[PDB]
């Protein structure tokens, strides 16, 4: 039993752990992701505890990570790239939606450059599986805004360049719970200042979600 993990985006080999609640991500190019998890653990442990899946350990080239979808009956997942891309500019200006649950139904294309209006529409598309209870969808948005606000505030004090990192947004079909966490440290770098570009990605998301939560 190798059970392939249903990824939203990326090209790394990710499988289910042999045990419950764990996924195994192969470090394809270097062990930098492991070096960065260990650096954050030693220098910014509060950031790791609040915003990042637990790293349970390492097996050869495999990271044993907390499965962020594990406690969900019917998870809907959106992957938003908020760190700098390797060569390309962001598809939505400050960030790039990499994919989401049911995106094929909406003709989402991760290579398409989007206007603000199309960006907002794809986020609304992601929220449609959450259903007709406007009040429950508002609560999911507000809980994301609560955590992302705190993240953006905390990023001012972190001397890392979060190149390539993604936000994984999750809500259950019934909107009974949600979360957002930072994943993919494989290109993160030590620097002597905060990462303003990544902070701008997060504040732009906060603005967009806040408009959605307030829309009548
Ligand atoms: N801890 C996690 N819990 C749940 N899903 C995760 C987790 N980490 C990754 N994912 C899933 O895997 C996808 C891609 O993961 P990630 O971005 O870490 O790897 P990647 O882009 O394939 O890797 P890399 O470019 O570093 O080789 C996400 O879109 C998401 O669906």
The domain locations on the chain are 14-66, 75-214
161 labelled as ligand-binding?
no
Of 4, 5, 7, 70, the residue with max ligand 1 atoms within 8 A of its CB, to mutate for a pocket test, comes to: 7
Q: 174 and 73 in contact (C-beta within 8 Å)?
A: yes
- Report residues whose beta carbon is within 6 angstroms of any ligand 1 atom: 7-12, 14, 23, 25, 28, 53, 65-69, 77, 79, 166, 168, 183-184, 186
133, β-bridge pairs: none
Q: Are 183 and 53 in contact (CB under 8 A)?
A: yes
71 contact partners, CB below 8 Å, separation of at least 6: 177
Residue 8 assigned ligand-binding role: yes
Q: How far apart (Å, rounded) are the C-alpha atoms in residues 184 and 166?
A: 6
Q: How far is the CA of 172 from the centre of ligand 1 (A)?
A: 19
3-state secondary structure of 174: coil
Measured from the Cα of 27, ligand 1's closest atom is: 27
From residue 101, give the alpha-carbon distance in Å to each of 6, 45, 209: 10, 31, 18
Structure tokens at 77: 């997942």
Q: Could you say which of 1.20.870.10, 2.130.10.10, 3.30.2320.20, 3.30.470.160 is the CATH number of the domain covering 75-214? A: 3.30.470.160
Atom 27, ligand 1: residue with shortest CA distance: 12
| Beta strands at 166-172 and 62-66: parallel, antiparallel or unpaired | unpaired
Contact 108, 99 (CB under 8 A): yes
Reported resolution in A?
A: 2.0
SS3 4: strand
Question: Is-contact 183 165, C-beta < 8 A?
Answer: yes
Distance CA 115, CA 119 (A): 6
Per DSSP, 85 falls in state P
Structure solved via: X-ray
Tell me which residue has tokens 């001012």: 156
């Amino acid at each position: 039993s190798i059970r392939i993990f249903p990824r939203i985006a990326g090209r790394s080999y990710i499988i289910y752990g042999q045990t419950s609640g764990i996924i195994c991500k192969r470090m394809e190019k270097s062990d930098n992701e492991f070096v960065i998890y260990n650096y954050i653990s030693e220098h910014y442990d509060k950031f790791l505890k609040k915003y990042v899946p637990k790293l349970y350990g390492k097996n050869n080239d495999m990271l044993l990570l907390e499965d962020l979808t594990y406690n969900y009956n019917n998870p809907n997942v959106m992957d938003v790239k908020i760190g700098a891309r390797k060569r390309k500019s962001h598809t939505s200006g400050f960030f790039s939606i990499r994919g989401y649950t049911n995106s094929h139904d909406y003709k989402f294309d991760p290579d398409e450059y989007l206007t603000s209006e199309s960006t907002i529409n794809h986020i609304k598309n992601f929220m449609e599986a959450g259903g007709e209870n406007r009040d429950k969808t508002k609560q999911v948005l507000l809980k994301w805004i609560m955590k992302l606000s705190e993240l953006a505030n905390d990023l001012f004090e972190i001397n890392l360049k979060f190149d390539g990192v993604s936000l994984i947004f999750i809500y259950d079909d019934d909107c009974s719970k949600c979360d957002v966490n930072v994943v993919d440290f494989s290109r993160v770098k030590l620097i002597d200042t905060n990462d303003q570009m990544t902070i701008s990605a997060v504040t732009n998301l906060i603005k967009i979600l806040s408009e959605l939560a307030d829309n009548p």
